[PDB]
Amino acid sequence: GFLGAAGSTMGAASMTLTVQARNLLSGIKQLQARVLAVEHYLRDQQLLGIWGCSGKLICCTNVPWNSSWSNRNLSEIWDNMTWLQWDKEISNYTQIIYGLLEESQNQQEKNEQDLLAL
Amino acid sequence: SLGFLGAAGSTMGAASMTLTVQARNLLSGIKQLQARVLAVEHYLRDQQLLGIWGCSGKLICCTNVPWNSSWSNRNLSEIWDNMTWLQWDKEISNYTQIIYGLLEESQNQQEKNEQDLLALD
Amino acid sequence: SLGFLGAAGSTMGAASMTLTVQARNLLGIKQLQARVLAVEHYLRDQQLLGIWGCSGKLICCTNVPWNSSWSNRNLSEIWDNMTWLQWDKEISNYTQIIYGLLEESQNQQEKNEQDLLALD
Amino acid sequence: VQLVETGGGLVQPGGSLKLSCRASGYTFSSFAMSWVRQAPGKGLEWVSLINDRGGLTFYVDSVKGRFTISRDNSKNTLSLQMHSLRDGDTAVYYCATGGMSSALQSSKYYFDFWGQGALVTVS
Amino acid sequence: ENLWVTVYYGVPVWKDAETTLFCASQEIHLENVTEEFNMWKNNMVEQMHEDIISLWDQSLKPCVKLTPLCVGLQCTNVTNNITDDMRGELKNCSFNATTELRNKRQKVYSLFYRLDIVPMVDLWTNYRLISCNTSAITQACPKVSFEPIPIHYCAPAGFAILKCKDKKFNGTGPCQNVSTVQCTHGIKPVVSTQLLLNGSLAEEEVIIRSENITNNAKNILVQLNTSVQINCTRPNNNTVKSIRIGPGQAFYYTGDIIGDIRQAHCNVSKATWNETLGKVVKQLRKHFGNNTIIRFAQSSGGDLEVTTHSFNCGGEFFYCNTSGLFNSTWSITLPCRIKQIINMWQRIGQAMYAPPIQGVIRCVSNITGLILTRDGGSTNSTTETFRPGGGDMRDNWRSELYKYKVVKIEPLGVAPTRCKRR
Ligand SMILES: *[C@@H]1O[C@H](CO)[C@@H](O[C@@H]2O[C@H](CO)[C@@H](O[C@@H]3O[C@H](CO)[C@@H](O)[C@H](O)[C@@H]3O)[C@H](O)[C@H]2NC(C)=O)[C@H](O)[C@H]1NC(C)=O
Ligand SMILES: *[C@@H]1O[C@H](CO)[C@@H](O[C@@H]2O[C@H](CO)[C@@H](O)[C@H](O)[C@H]2NC(C)=O)[C@H](O)[C@H]1NC(C)=O
Ligand SMILES: *[C@@H]1O[C@H](CO)[C@@H](O[C@@H]2O[C@H](CO)[C@@H](O)[C@H](O)[C@H]2NC(C)=O)[C@H](O)[C@H]1NC(C)=O
Ligand SMILES: *[C@@H]1O[C@H](CO)[C@@H](O[C@@H]2O[C@H](CO)[C@@H](O)[C@H](O)[C@H]2NC(C)=O)[C@H](O)[C@H]1NC(C)=O
Ligand SMILES: *[C@@H]1O[C@H](CO)[C@@H](O)[C@H](O)[C@H]1NC(C)=O
Ligand SMILES: *[C@@H]1O[C@H](CO)[C@@H](O)[C@H](O)[C@H]1NC(C)=O
Ligand SMILES: *[C@@H]1O[C@H](CO)[C@@H](O)[C@H](O)[C@H]1NC(C)=O
Ligand SMILES: *[C@@H]1O[C@H](CO)[C@@H](O)[C@H](O)[C@H]1NC(C)=O
Ligand SMILES: *[C@@H]1O[C@H](CO)[C@@H](O)[C@H](O)[C@H]1NC(C)=O
Ligand SMILES: *[C@@H]1O[C@H](CO)[C@@H](O)[C@H](O)[C@H]1NC(C)=O
Ligand SMILES: *[C@@H]1O[C@H](CO)[C@@H](O)[C@H](O)[C@H]1NC(C)=O
Ligand SMILES: *[C@@H]1O[C@H](CO)[C@@H](O)[C@H](O)[C@H]1NC(C)=O
Ligand SMILES: *[C@@H]1O[C@H](CO)[C@@H](O)[C@H](O)[C@H]1NC(C)=O
Ligand SMILES: *[C@@H]1O[C@H](CO)[C@@H](O)[C@H](O)[C@H]1NC(C)=O
Ligand SMILES: *[C@@H]1O[C@H](CO)[C@@H](O)[C@H](O)[C@H]1NC(C)=O
Ligand SMILES: *[C@@H]1O[C@H](CO)[C@@H](O)[C@H](O)[C@H]1NC(C)=O
Ligand SMILES: *[C@@H]1O[C@H](CO)[C@@H](O)[C@H](O)[C@H]1NC(C)=O
Ligand SMILES: *[C@@H]1O[C@H](CO)[C@@H](O)[C@H](O)[C@H]1NC(C)=O
Ligand SMILES: *[C@@H]1O[C@H](CO)[C@@H](O)[C@H](O)[C@H]1NC(C)=O
Ligand SMILES: *[C@@H]1O[C@H](CO)[C@@H](O)[C@H](O)[C@H]1NC(C)=O
Ligand SMILES: *[C@@H]1O[C@H](CO)[C@@H](O)[C@H](O)[C@H]1NC(C)=O
Ligand SMILES: *[C@@H]1O[C@H](CO)[C@@H](O)[C@H](O)[C@H]1NC(C)=O
Ligand SMILES: *[C@@H]1O[C@H](CO)[C@@H](O)[C@H](O)[C@H]1NC(C)=O
Ligand SMILES: *[C@@H]1O[C@H](CO)[C@@H](O)[C@H](O)[C@H]1NC(C)=O
Ligand SMILES: *[C@@H]1O[C@H](CO)[C@@H](O)[C@H](O)[C@H]1NC(C)=O
Ligand SMILES: *[C@@H]1O[C@H](CO)[C@@H](O)[C@H](O)[C@H]1NC(C)=O
Ligand SMILES: *[C@@H]1O[C@H](CO)[C@@H](O)[C@H](O)[C@H]1NC(C)=O
Ligand SMILES: *[C@@H]1O[C@H](CO)[C@@H](O)[C@H](O)[C@H]1NC(C)=O
């Protein structure tokens, strides 16, 4: 169910991404609410697009993980944490991570542009 | 060449070549804004539903869900050469939600398999 | 680091490095009309890229060859010696032909890929 | 279906030769087309295949860098342009219909409606 | 057969759906497409009705209210060369009106129609205006008009309008000649109660449309292929005067009449209306038995808005009497009355005052259809009677929207192919 995996561990909650999806899109106040929901959805989709993750729910990237963001191992991160606690732990670095993700895509397309130019 | 819905009465094979003509026509005082928001919401729900299936950015999307003979047992010649999209859509009523669920599950498995394949050093 | 449209007066080969800066800045009745028209312009551009098979990309290479009748210039003068505004003015009223060719090329590519993926 | 080769029949080693097929008894644009080669006394082998729309071409490795196969749905014409012909390419070249179909058609993966065959000799 | 699901976007499939349409002020033919239409389930009619009500109500808000009127007034017989037909129909009435100053009064006289006045027993007065005990009266702004300017209904993006072009389409059932449009043709919101004016003509014969041709409670819409020209007129050179009744609120009234006073008559040519009724009967005989002798009769009594034919003319709101028509056993002049305090949409609480229009009014309208209500009693005989009648004012727009349907586009679909991913 919607947000049912919020209290589950991240390893289990990552398999319900399509359940959390679809609930993002569906007298002046109702129209403002609809426009706001559409605007937030499109901002998130554009943010994925500029990272090279468009059309995917689980997108792997080329940005290495910095141990200063979190020094936990994968077993502790994925089996002993929920997404809410993880989101709280690394919120102070989230925008930095986003910037790095954007930069990686800026390089990646240029490399592809060169590889297809041979 | 045939117009917005000119291929509606043509066969499914012929009509499959006019997808962009119809795709362009899905996007283009309080009630006018309500109509525009409804059009945007329908477009975005369809694009999201394609994205869930891994079909984002394509108008013709091949998938990994096998066709069940209980949905329709017609061969490809009858479906594509002797039938229109309206008659076909009528034929597969009550089955589209099963197909959509199977496509969603198949793409979730595809994403997990791709993530695991990309995790090999 | 230059900011929104900061590269507008730079050359095309330099301004092409700041596409994400422009992309991130594209998103009571009058206020709703302005927000809905901004959303509609964004969605029409994204649908148009999708029709061309360029969804999810900012720099998208295609299979349409360049016609010498559209702009009889070499890459050095186009990319290193002129701006995107001058280019946009130079190829005005040629963009609809290019868009039609891109649409047809993507339709042919989708049919070819479907046929290639139909081989056992 | 009266599929008839109108190509040449004598070339020097290292030269080029064009073959073509004309069809009349079937819808040309509805079928894939191919060329199949029969060297004397060695049986038959497939050489090249083209899709029904003409956008896709496939070759055996021994000719991939030398032969170009093309088709024109107008005038119902198949063409094969062979460059750098070798002594091993002396054979009867037959037109064939099928061997491929689009995703919206039933499977074939077989050859039908064979032509009568052009004889190509490399001196 | 080793078939796999392939998803297509841009699929030419649509489903019946209704939504909000744009009011504006091309056609693509669909070969081998048969669509089912139903003009009595088409929500474009209800939306057009509600939109016209909204525009009507909004147009009367920024206008002069007549609450300084609705006083007792003393009426007498008009002194002029008045014919017999106009005796008692027009009265010369006087009243005390307010001025631009709160503490001033003026004595004003004007000519009112009898239908705008109700008798009242009081002292120094003997009449009052109608719709003063109930509702309120708002004067229509003189700077606007009621001309039926054609409008277009346009579907929103994601929707399409299907148009049926079958020459003999009867408003329901399958249609084989179908085209797709984004906007309808220009539709004139002409307001009439018994005859359909300035509408569309049929390509062939006469088209008889009814939700249930055997149920007497449903109306029959008759659309002709040829128009019948109706010429109407108010042959009286009325001189219109105006007064200020408040700080910037001006009231318009009939001041006087120059020349003799005669009725407002409307002429229907005999040589066209005859044989037009013959064609209507010939097509009615396609649904009723050949042994039945179809007769026409004047409508039954009741409210004036339904017993009379009340087409708007220019700015006056003529209420012609159609007893000269639809009287047979299958030049005609008909006495056309007028009125000024109008309950336009069969509503109480929104009475509108139509100001008199200067000079003579001579309208030339095209009759393109009409509304029949049958005998009502459905007599089990061979003398079936058709009376004209009205409705809820939506049939006037069904006569134009009958050929349009709104559909929602379903661009997403699935189909088996031999295309496996990977
Ligand atoms: C059906 O259509 C006819 C023809 O369009 C309508 O008659 C037209 O009505 C308009 C408005 O009533 C007339 O305009 C008027 O013209 C005079 C010219 O002096 C002007 O002073 C007025 O202010 C107004 O603009 C127009 O002349 C008239 N056309 C003809 C040929 O007579 C008719 O009213 C329509 N039917 C109904 C029921 O409305
Ligand atoms: C309506 O009545 C008014 C007053 O009852 C008439 O106005 C008077 O008309 C006479 C002519 O018959 C003049 O001599 C007076 O001077 C008028 N008085 C005022 C105050 O105007 C008016 O003429 C009548 N109108 C009609 C059409 O009968
Ligand atoms: C309009 O108002 C005038 C006065 O403002 C009315 O005439 C007077 O009526 C009173 C009734 O009590 C008489 O006593 C006066 O003699 C009248 N005035 C004159 C000068 O004779 C008149 O009746 C009002 N008319 C209407 C229709 O309301
Ligand atoms: C408001 O006044 C009107 C008349 O102006 C009243 O109309 C009456 O209607 C009934 C029919 O229902 C008739 O029998 C009466 O004769 C009418 N009255 C007159 C004076 O002719 C109407 O009833 C009044 N409104 C209300 C709510 O009572
Ligand atoms: C909550 O924690 C318990 C601990 O055993 C676990 O069994 C349960 O599955 C958890 N809830 C969810 C929704 O995963
Ligand atoms: C990790 O982060 C620190 C500061 O948070 C930074 O100095 C360091 O360079 C980062 N790691 C890499 C590999 O760049
Ligand atoms: C992860 O770190 C924690 C530190 O609390 C440790 O207890 C745990 O064993 C570690 N896991 C692995 C797989 O090394
Ligand atoms: C984030 O920063 C705020 C103040 O900048 C600090 O109070 C908070 O604890 C920080 N979060 C983490 C997870 O360290
Ligand atoms: C309608 O059907 C006929 C059948 O002969 C076909 O030839 C025609 O192409 C069809 N219409 C369209 C628009 O394809
Ligand atoms: C088709 O649907 C039926 C419904 O029970 C199911 O049993 C069958 O396995 C399905 N076919 C395939 C190939 O999965
Ligand atoms: C498809 O099925 C129909 C009906 O059974 C049959 O007539 C037709 O020949 C079949 N076609 C193929 C290619 O199997
Ligand atoms: C879908 O279900 C309805 C329910 O009665 C049925 O009438 C209809 O025929 C079904 N669809 C098909 C294609 O059989
Ligand atoms: C403006 O032109 C000069 C000329 O060389 C160039 O050096 C400078 O970088 C240009 N400005 C920008 C923003 O690129
Ligand atoms: C585009 O190129 C073709 C040849 O490649 C030429 O015939 C055509 O005229 C060119 N386009 C224009 C607009 O001139
Ligand atoms: C491009 O064309 C211009 C036009 O004269 C010329 O000056 C310039 O040298 C050319 N550059 C190249 C790299 O060919
Ligand atoms: C097309 O664009 C060029 C670019 O300068 C312009 O000169 C030309 O006038 C345009 N064509 C028309 C018909 O305006
Ligand atoms: C005024 O008109 C009415 C209408 O019927 C009539 O009964 C009355 O006798 C007339 N009075 C005069 C004085 O002409
Ligand atoms: C309208 O025409 C259709 C055409 O099939 C017919 O079935 C239907 O009974 C007709 N209805 C009326 C009221 O004439
Ligand atoms: C459909 O209507 C159009 C209107 O122009 C006409 O040309 C066409 O012949 C009609 N077709 C049929 C089959 O009635
Ligand atoms: C109108 O229909 C009648 C029916 O018989 C016919 O006689 C007449 O010629 C038609 N007129 C036109 C203009 O189509
Ligand atoms: C009309 O209504 C009557 C009411 O009983 C019904 O019997 C009849 O079948 C209806 N006819 C149509 C055509 O709907
Ligand atoms: C109506 O007909 C009568 C008959 O004589 C004529 O006097 C009158 O002027 C006509 N009016 C119009 C408006 O045609
Ligand atoms: C109506 O008046 C016009 C003048 O515009 C005249 O030609 C026509 O014959 C008249 N028709 C009738 C029925 O009086
Ligand atoms: C009634 O008369 C018309 C006149 O032509 C005829 O076509 C129709 O068939 C007749 N009906 C019957 C039931 O005989
Ligand atoms: C129309 O005129 C006739 C002529 O006698 C009359 O009987 C009928 O009542 C009139 N209609 C109205 C609504 O007054
Ligand atoms: C109807 O027509 C008859 C035929 O003579 C006539 O006597 C009668 O007066 C007419 N009805 C009206 C209301 O004029
Ligand atoms: C009515 O009379 C006035 C008197 O001034 C005149 O100006 C006007 O033209 C006349 N109108 C008609 C329609 O006779
Ligand atoms: C009325 O009918 C006549 C008949 O030819 C036509 O010329 C005229 O345009 C029509 N007027 C309207 C407003 O429909």
Numbering used by the authors:
A (entry chain B): 521 to 546, 572 to 663
B (entry chain F): 519 to 546, 572 to 664
C (entry chain E): 519 to 545, 572 to 664
D (entry chain K): 2 to 52, 52A, 53 to 82, 82A, 82B, 82C, 83 to 100, 100A, ...
E (entry chain D): 32 to 56, 82 to 141, 150 to 309, 311 to 395, 413 to 504
Copy text from the publication.
We found that adjuvanted protein or mRNA-LNP immunization of rhesus macaques with ApexGT6, an Env trimer engineered to bind Apex bnAb precursors, consistently induced Apex bnAb-related precursors with long HCDR3s bearing bnAb-like sequence motifs. Cryo-electron microscopy revealed that elicited Apex bnAb-related HCDR3s possessed structures combining elements of several prototype Apex bnAbs. The primary hurdle to eliciting Apex bnAbs is believed to be the low frequency of bnAb-precursor B cells possessing a long (≥ 24 amino acid [aa]) and acidic HCDR3 that can penetrate the glycan shield and bind to the positively charged surface within the Apex epitopic region. We designed a slightly improved germline-targeting trimer, ApexGT6, with affinity for additional PCT64- and PG9-class precursors, and we evaluated B cell responses to this trimer delivered as an adjuvanted soluble protein or mRNA-encoded membrane-anchored protein in RMs.
ApexGT6 induced mAbs possessed structural features similar to three prototype human Apex bnAbs. Beyond the HCDR3s, RM018 also exhibited extensive glycan interactions with the heavy chain framework regions (FR) 2 and 3, as well as CDR2s, similar to CH04 but with the heavy chain and light chain positions reversed. Our finding that RM018 had a binding mode sharing features with CH01–04 bnAbs prompted us to revisit the idea of targeting this class of Apex bnAbs. We concluded that JH4-variant CH01–04 bnAbs are an important vaccine target and ApexGT6 has the potential to prime precursors for this class of bnAb. In summary, we found that Apex bnAb-like BCRs induced by ApexGT6 exhibited structural features similar to those of three human Apex bnAbs. This suggested that ApexGT6 might be capable of eliciting multiple Apex bnAb-related responses simultaneously. In the cryo-EM structures, we observed a dependency on the engineered V2b loop, where several germline targeting mutations are located.
